[PDB]
């Protein structure tokens, strides 16, 4: 096993997907080096839910799942097991038995237009709460009240995916924080990704 895991492709990027439709990257045979994760670029806390970054260079897993998006600063606390909210019920679900880490960092210089950013969409209203690790992208109108809308999208029928509306001149908190979550699985399976 001489390949090197491309962690320099998730953190190093320019076109992170939106929260309502994220990208799931699966890691295969390689050797991972966690030094650059915490030794260098300490923008925010490593926020490791299981085990610890200090002991992340000896144990190894089968596959690594990377999920990336951009969210609100005030919504950052919503990215944790056992919590619910406007993005933890219809947008992104974190299982209560989650293992791995979440990395958030400020992205003002990256995602900010003079008028603002509106390409990022998030779902607001939906029938029920999401199952863990499930994607529910769908273009449809919400039937609110007693009026069976047939695509009119008028009164009492609101489009769930709401434009986000970032800003480069507003105070902190609402400024975009880019979040990449790394998920692991330790099981009696043939080892595929292991560090030095």
């Amino acid at each position, epitope marked *: 096993i*001489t*390949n*090197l895991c*491309p962690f*320099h*492709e998730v953190f*190093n*990027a*320019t*076109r992170f997907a939106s929260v309502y439709a994220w990208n799931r*990257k699966r890691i295969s045979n390689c050797v991972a080096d966690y030094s650059v994760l915490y030794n260098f670029a300490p923008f925010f806390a490593f926020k490791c839910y299981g085990v610890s970054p200090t002991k992340l260079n000896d144990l190894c897993f089968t596959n690594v799942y990377a999920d990336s998006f951009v969210i609100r600063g005030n919504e950052v606390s919503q990215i944790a097991p056992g919590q619910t909210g406007n993005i933890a019920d219809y947008n992104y679900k974190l299982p209560d038995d989650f293992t791995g880490c979440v990395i958030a960092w400020n992205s003002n*210089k*990256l995602d*900010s*237009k*003079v008028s603002g950013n509106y390409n990022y969409l998030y779902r607001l209203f939906r029938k029920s709460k999401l199952k863990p690790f499930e994607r529910d992208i769908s273009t449809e109108i919400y039937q609110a009240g007693n009026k069976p809308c047939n695509g009119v999208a008028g009164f009492n029928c609101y489009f769930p995916l709401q434009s986000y509306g970032f800003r480069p001149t507003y105070g902190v908190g609402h400024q975009p924080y880019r979040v990449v979550v790394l998920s692991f699985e330790l099981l009696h399976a043939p080892a595929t990704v292991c560090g030095p």
Partner: antibody, heavy 123, light 108 residues
Framework: QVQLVQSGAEVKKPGASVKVSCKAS????????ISWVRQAPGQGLEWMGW????????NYAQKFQGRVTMTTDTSTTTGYMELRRLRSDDTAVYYC????????????????????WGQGTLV | EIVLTQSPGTLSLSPGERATLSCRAS???????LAWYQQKPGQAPRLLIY???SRATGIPDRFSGSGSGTDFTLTISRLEPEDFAVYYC????????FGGGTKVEIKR
């Protein structure tokens, strides 16, 4: 510490094919792609080729599409042009660089550029 | 494709003076996709800046970058006369296109 070396200067006549080698050392030749660029005297650079190393995907420019094909030998960690259809006044220096703009595994755009350059070869 | 526009045709400056370089875009270029390159006589180009102002290799106190959206520039201060090199700027959003270039002279 990173080292990039190539072959010596070559002289060719139109109608033949030119094979150019680029040896790389000092870094793992698996997590970075190879970018091959032209530089002709009196003008700037071009973007002939982008090649991955983990797989065989290429990103040949449409200007030279259908004429450029190059390979990678991971045993020696070398890039080979086997350029065909040589033309008279295409004499220019050739540069091989370790690219940090497109990932070698998944292929999305990166942030960066060309960080290590060879000595270039002349035909 | 996407083409870049440079109009510092020739800089007539003595060493140690302010140096401004322009890499104006055609229609739209993303903020987090750019590159700059030095070019010394009889050598190979090297990477200098890979974004807004992020340094790549050394950059002691002179090389800085700025800009936003569709315009971008590079700033040099206290120019010690060793460099006097050619400057290249590269875009990244649509395929890959180098800039025309810019010559820096001695100002005898």
């Amino acid at each position: 510490q990173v080292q990039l070396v190539q072959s010596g200067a070559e002289v060719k006549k139109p109608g033949a094919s030119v094979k150019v080698s680029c040896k790389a050392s000092g870094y793992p030749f698996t997590s970075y792609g190879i970018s091959w660029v032209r530089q002709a005297p009196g003008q700037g650079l071009e973007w002939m080729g982008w090649i991955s190393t983990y797989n065989g995907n290429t990103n040949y420019a449409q200007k030279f599409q259908g004429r450029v094909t190059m390979t990678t030998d991971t045993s020696t960690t070398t890039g080979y042009m086997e350029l065909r259809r040589l033309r008279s006044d295409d004499t220019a220096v050739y540069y091989c660089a370790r690219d940090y703009t497109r990932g070698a595994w998944f292929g999305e755009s990166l942030i960066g550029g060309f960080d290590n350059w060879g000595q270039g070869t002349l035909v | 494709e996407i083409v870049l526009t440079q109009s510092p045709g020739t800089l007539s400056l003595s060493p140690g003076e302010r140096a401004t370089l322009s890499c104006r875009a055609s229609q739209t270029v993303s903020s987090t996709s750019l590159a700059w390159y030095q070019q010394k006589p009889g050598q190979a180009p090297r990477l200098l800046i890979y974004g807004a102002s992020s340094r790549a290799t050394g950059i002691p106190d002179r090389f800085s970058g700025s800009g936003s959206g569709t315009d971008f520039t590079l700033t040099i201060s206290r120019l010690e006369p060793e460099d006097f090199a050619v400057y290249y700027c590269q875009q990244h959003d649509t395929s890959l296109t180098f800039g025309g270039g810019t010559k820096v002279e001695i100002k005898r």
